[PDB]
Amino acid sequence: GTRNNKGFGSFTVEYINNQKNICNVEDTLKENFAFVYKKKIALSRQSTLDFIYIYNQIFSTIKKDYQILKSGYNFRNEYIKSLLFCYFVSKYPN
RNA sequence: AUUAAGACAUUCGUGAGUGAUUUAUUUCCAUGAAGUGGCGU
């Protein structure tokens, strides 16, 4: 789908020809990708509004986390420097 | 006046009768409606 790289079209397989699939997500990502990181989302209670409350946190966090590596955060009195910018200052070409 | 004289190889007669330019053949193969955030430090 559109903007798929930010996690908008995630699907998983449940039944293959009426057989329950047991595929560990961690090692499946390990073999296919060079680097894999896991983020612990806040296991807030009232997990009955599964759709909106969880989705809003996850995508706000992704926008938060992605707009840390690329550019920075500039809102209220809270500033995180661009990690990409910090990365290139550290190295030799500066 | 001489084995001679006269005598259309002619009459009638449809190149016609039966016959499907038809049978077989995928306008199909490949292809992300996707990409990116920016400024207010």
Paired residues of A15 in beta bridges: A20
Structural method: cryo-EM
Q: Which nucleotide is nearest to A71 (CA to C1')?
A: B38
- Cα(A55)–Cα(A11) distance, rounded to whole angstroms? 15
CA-wise closest residue to A25 among A10, A42, A15, A3: A10
Residues within a 7 A CB radius of strand B? A 1-5, 9, 66-67, 70-72, 74-75, 79
Question: Which tokens sit at A26?
Answer: 């961690």
Distance of A42 CA from B6 C1′ (whole Å): 144
Angle at A67 between CA A66 and CA A68, to 5 degrees: 90
Q: Compute how many other C-beta atoms are within 10 angstroms of the C-beta atom of residue A81.
A: 12
Q: Which nucleotide is nearest to A69 (CA to C1')?
A: B37
Distance of A37 CA from B34 C1′ (whole Å): 27
Query: Which residues neighbour A84 within 8 Å (Cβ) at sequence distance 6 or greater?
Result: A69, A70
Q: Which nucleotide is nearest to A75 (CA to C1')?
A: B40
DSSP summary character for residue A79? E
